[PDB]
Write a protein that binds this ligand. Sequence first.
Ligand SMILES: [Cs+]
Ligand SMILES: [Cs+]
Ligand SMILES: [Cs+]
Ligand SMILES: [Cs+]
Ligand SMILES: [Cs+]
Ligand SMILES: [Cs+]
Ligand SMILES: [Cs+]
Ligand SMILES: [Cs+]
Ligand SMILES: [Cs+]
Lengths: 341, 341, 341
Amino acid sequence: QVTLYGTIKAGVEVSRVKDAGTYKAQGGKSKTATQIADFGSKIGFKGQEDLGNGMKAIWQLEQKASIAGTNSGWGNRQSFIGLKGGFGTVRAGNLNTVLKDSGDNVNAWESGSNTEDVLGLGTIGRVESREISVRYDSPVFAGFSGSVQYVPRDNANDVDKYKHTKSSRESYHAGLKYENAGFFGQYAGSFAKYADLNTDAERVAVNTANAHPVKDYQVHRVVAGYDANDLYVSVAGQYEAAKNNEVGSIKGKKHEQTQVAATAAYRFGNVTPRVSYAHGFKAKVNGVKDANYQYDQVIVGADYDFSKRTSALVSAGWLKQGKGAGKVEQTASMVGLRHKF
Amino acid sequence: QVTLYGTIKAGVEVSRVKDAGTYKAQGGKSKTATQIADFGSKIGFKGQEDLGNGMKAIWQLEQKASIAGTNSGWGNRQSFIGLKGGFGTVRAGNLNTVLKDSGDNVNAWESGSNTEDVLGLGTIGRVESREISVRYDSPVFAGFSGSVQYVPRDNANDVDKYKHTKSSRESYHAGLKYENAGFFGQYAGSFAKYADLNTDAERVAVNTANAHPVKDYQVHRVVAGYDANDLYVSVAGQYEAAKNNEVGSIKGKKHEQTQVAATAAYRFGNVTPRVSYAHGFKAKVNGVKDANYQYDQVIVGADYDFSKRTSALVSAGWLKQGKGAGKVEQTASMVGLRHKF
Amino acid sequence: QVTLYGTIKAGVEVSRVKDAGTYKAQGGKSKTATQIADFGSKIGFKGQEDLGNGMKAIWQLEQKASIAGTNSGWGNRQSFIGLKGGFGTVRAGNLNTVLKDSGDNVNAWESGSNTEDVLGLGTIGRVESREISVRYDSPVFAGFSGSVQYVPRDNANDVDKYKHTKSSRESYHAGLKYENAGFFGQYAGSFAKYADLNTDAERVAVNTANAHPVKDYQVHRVVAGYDANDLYVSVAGQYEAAKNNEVGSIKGKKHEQTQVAATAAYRFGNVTPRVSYAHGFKAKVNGVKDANYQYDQVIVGADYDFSKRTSALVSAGWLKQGKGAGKVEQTASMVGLRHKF
Ligand SMILES: [Cs+]
Ligand SMILES: [Cs+]
Ligand SMILES: [Cs+]
Ligand SMILES: [Cs+]
Ligand SMILES: [Cs+]
Ligand SMILES: [Cs+]
Ligand SMILES: [Cs+]
Ligand SMILES: [Cs+]
Ligand SMILES: [Cs+]
């Protein structure tokens, strides 16, 4: 067996930044931008074959396909080959991280890439990625399931394959999930003995310009809520910590940040109003409080479901980053359309 | 619903340039080149869903796929999401321009990209493009239909989104079409308060190397003819005008050019002989006649239709550019094969 | 008609190099690398239409799609348009070379690109490629078939289309095959009046950095064996020769190399153990023996066929390159999974 699927989705966004530092216009305000933007249209191919003994072969090839025609590549969304049966599921390839998957219960919004941080809970998602990796998923059993996932050294750093001179950027991802009668709890997280962050605290490839080597990199996410009877509510807590691993005065000093997010939605027939709130507390950077990494955000909107495949979408969002005169405030709103095939 | 389609098409071309300026060989003639060339093979995916109230969701993702394996990208031909119903059709994405669509009644030929100007009426098509835009199409009503289409500022110039420092390259596209009993007339055109041309008078992105900012950029196309009873004839008139908007001695001075084209074809069973003629009159460039932009061309050929999907193609073309010792003459011929799926 | 197909395939490889020159660690050994690697996953689209008179239209578009998400492009595997009927088959596009096709009887192994030379008989395949070309295939007749294939000048060197100043890199490919009662013999080969090699003796584009222009470039391959009754055995001989065509002291001097390979496999139900051996004798380079181009390799492994579409794969390989203190030794092993759709 073999099937074609995808989502086409897009809309118009309207945004404004308030940033004293970069916009000399009055009160530090940018002008208002108005863009047709693709929201992450995608196309895939996938299939499975019964292997005779309760085992199945599974594979998938999913690609970014933006109707603005700005993508190229195959396999640059989750793509894999694997086996599934009574044991659970094993998969190898460009895999979502346990934490990328858990993000479905945290960030429900659609936006173009420009507005990810204001029209969506982009900041809490900064820890989410796809990795050439292997992943095991369970058995859902007595309402419990789990995943375990690993990125080898020589996949995390190809260059260094044969000379093991940079320390390993191999990493571990794992989660545990419980569902009962509409109630869900999940823990998802990751660990990397050595990694590298950019200044927005995203993981980037070893040897990226302005990469900051870190050590004992760890992320934890707990999510809980209720998804049943027209009602959805979700609350997430996230904690990130690493040690400075750059050679310099500050090696060994402690990085950390705490983020929380909350979403509520109610389904009124075909209309689903949604509200979200997120906050990042002050980061400790090199052992010292850094309020540049603090933020607050609220998003409100709704989906109109024409069909089970097709929705109209509207949202607006209000985001505040940092403290004082370093302050950045983003405002945005959009209207859009989504169609799943 | 969801469907796969495409055209595979290709052939061998044979071409020669006569250009004193660049070819020192006798009488200013290049040698004769002989190439297997893809004619613009393409592949798409598209679909629609009835939404209940005479409304439909529509989407499409079409890509260049050249069997020479030189393309990459998704969505780099017309791709969109939209709604269709009694109101007409609304669409947003990488859209053909009203003028790109009207080009189906002007330039019927197939050629590789190298021969577009000699094996096809490439020059009159220089005004045709795809744009991240929104488009409304009518209702065909009493034989009349029309389209209206817009490219926002912040899609025409992303860089400048928030600092509105370069003037808008937002643009408007529109057309009106009438069909009666084989007879067709159409007006298609466009307007851009500010734009940027290259020296072959194609629109290019703001801030392209050797881009020439222009103002009040306008194109008009009227096409008329007859498409019925084995007989096809088309006559087109095109007019382009803009003001110099480059800072320098010549700002405010007037650009313009007039082009005409004519095609006739007759269907003799499975064979369709075709003849085309096109002419560009002298351009006024910076208020002054410039005969470098004058050209004449004739193309003759035929299609052999094996099936409704599959054709053999042959053509030859004879093109003259400019006047005097700046003169460029292109000669070409091809044989090819086209298959629609 | 129109069909979708592909192969997804991938695994974990483990490799080690022993190279005194580049690895200062003890006894000239690299460390051991361990990688999830795609084995050349691919996806295609193809179809055919009966044209009425025993003739068919045929086309194909095949792309590299690696589930590690590192490819982009359409048409970058064999892709074409063509006609098929009582005359044989004619095709134009990104075609496999007669010698690339013959490689199916020589190199049966799957490996990621990093291990092609140790987990697969990569070296003998150095002469195999895809080319924008035309190809004729026969009629299988009294057990005999054949192919003839040509790459025009102006496809081998686009740049030089109109100025015929570099000599032609046009080339000819041809083969002859016989099958009788499990027994097969094939000759495949190629000739290019002028070409360009890199130092691993692969053909590269004219004007590639460190390309070495050659003249009278010729390759010959004879393969023979037995493919029936659970038993497969293949023996190949390959010979490559060219003259130095670089301007310098050594123009006109003779390049050549001889390679042989052997494979045996036996099918035990669903398990197919396989063993392969290959050897490259000393190259003559500029008229002089060069033992850097000598190598020996053995690969052993097996396929486990879950289904006709789906296999588990394991192999190990042991490769030795050159003589003496220039010596390079590669060791590798892998486990993998393949699924055809
Ligand atoms: Cs998103
Ligand atoms: Cs992310
Ligand atoms: Cs990654
Ligand atoms: Cs064309
Ligand atoms: Cs064009
Ligand atoms: Cs464009
Ligand atoms: Cs291979
Ligand atoms: Cs090869
Ligand atoms: Cs090639």
